[PDB]
Amino acid sequence: EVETFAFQAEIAQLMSLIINTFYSNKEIFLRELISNSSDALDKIRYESLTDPSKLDSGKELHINLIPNKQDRTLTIVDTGIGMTKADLINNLGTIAKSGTKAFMEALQAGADISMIGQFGVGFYSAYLVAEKVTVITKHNDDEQYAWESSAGGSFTVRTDTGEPMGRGTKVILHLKEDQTEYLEERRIKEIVKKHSQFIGYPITLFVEK
């Protein structure tokens, strides 16, 4: 059972701007997604401070980076708080409408796309390098869901029947044909060292056969 939704007009405009603007510094997508994962891990850690049972779905707080050259996917996995179905539909738990408004005013006033994260809509920087993005997520208060969009004004949400995750979020980037450098081990390490050196959770870069 697959539900198809239209993006709010402002969010469709944001993804069009990300996809169509000439902007060479695409590597910041990874910083933005890792920062999102850190934020989600902060949230479940804070909740566990007064209620330890919130970690019954998994005690480890970490971030894994999983490149797959056969599938041409880069997957960012975290064991953070996750998102409910309502969160997914409401722009993946962001205030994307007012964030897009502020971001686009900043762009016409000196800013560049690399500062997208200061406006709370850094997730959509995934479309700098991905033709399609799948988000698998599991929140303690809801079931496991899959969100997916190839932009173009719509996204889908369905119940996920894949591997159960316990708790957290998995962002699967289906990379553009000319963006496969972000599957290379040395390129990912360089980006993590450059932009994510002070993230307070272990980041594990998986290797391939």
Ligand X SMILES: Cn1c(=O)oc2cc(S(N)(=O)=O)ccc21
Q: Is 36 annotated as a binding residue?
A: yes
Residue among 48, 57, 64, 156 that touches ligand X (CB under 6 A): 64
Burial of 152 (0-12, 13-18, 19+ CB in 10 A): exposed
| Subset of 67-126 contacting ligand X (CB under 6 A) | 75, 77
Is there binding between residue 66 and ligand X (CB under 6 A)?
Answer: yes
Nearer to ligand X, 64 or 156 (CB): 64
State how far the Cα of 199 lies from the Cα of 209, in Å rounded to an integer.
Answer: 28
Number of neighbouring beta carbons within 10 Å of residue 60? 10
* CA–CA distance, 106 with 116 (Å, rounded to integer): 10
Contacts (CB under 6 A) with ligand X, residues 121-150: none
The answer to the question of whether 51 is labelled as a binding residue is no
123 is in an annotated binding site: yes
Q: What residues between 167 and 196 interact with ligand X by CB under 6 A? A: 170
Q: Which of 137, 138, 140, 164 is nearest to 52 (CA)?
A: 140
What are the residues whose beta carbons fall under 8 Å from the beta carbon of 144, sequence distance 6 or more?
136, 137, 138, 159, 160, 162, 164, 165
- State the minimum distance, in angstroms, from the CB of residue 93 to ligand X: 20
Q: What is the closest distance, in whole angstroms, from the C-beta atom of residue 66 to ligand X in the complex?
A: 6
Closest-CA residue to 37 (of 187, 207, 192): 192
Binding residue count for ligand X, defined by CB under 6 A: 5
Which residue lies nearer to ligand X by CB, 23 or 206? 206
Pick out the residues of the known binding site for ATP. 36, 78, 97, 123
> Binding residues for ligand X, per CB under 6 A?
64, 66, 75, 77, 170
